[PDB]
């Protein structure tokens, strides 16, 4: 899930009050890879938000269609959020 961008080494003496103690440190800088999240967490949310705009192109009198579309988009967003909370 990560990619090691860089690794570093440092040697130093920690000046603790009683006396100085040696120390080495090996650091890694990880950078997270996002193709998972872009393809799976952002794409469906963007698509559902786009689908929610379809109601504006439907007539006002078509109450059942617009209501079903809007509330089912809300339900789909709820499902995505809850299950993504569970998985992540």
């Amino acid at each position: 899930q990560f990619s090691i961008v860089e690794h570093r080494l440092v040697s130093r003496n920690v000046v603790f009050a009683t006396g100085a103690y040696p120390r080495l440190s090996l650091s890694f800088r990880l950078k997270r890879n996002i193709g998972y999240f872009i393809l799976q967490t952002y794409m469906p949310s963007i698509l559902i938000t786009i689908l929610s705009w379809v109601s504006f192109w439907i007539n006002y009198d078509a109450s059942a269609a617009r209501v079903a579309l809007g509330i089912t988009t809300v339900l789909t967003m709820t499902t995505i959020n809850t299950h993504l909370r569970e998985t992540l």
């Binding site: 689908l51 379809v54 192109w57 439907i58 009198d61």
Partner: peptide, 22 residues
């Protein structure tokens, strides 16, 4: 989205009556 585009061009709000010749 295809259905949305189809519905955008629908004129009459009533389907075929089943007893007419168009």
């Amino acid at each position: 989205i295809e259905f949305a585009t189809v519905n955008y061009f629908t004129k009459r709000g009533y389907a075929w009556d089943g007893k007419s010749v168009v």
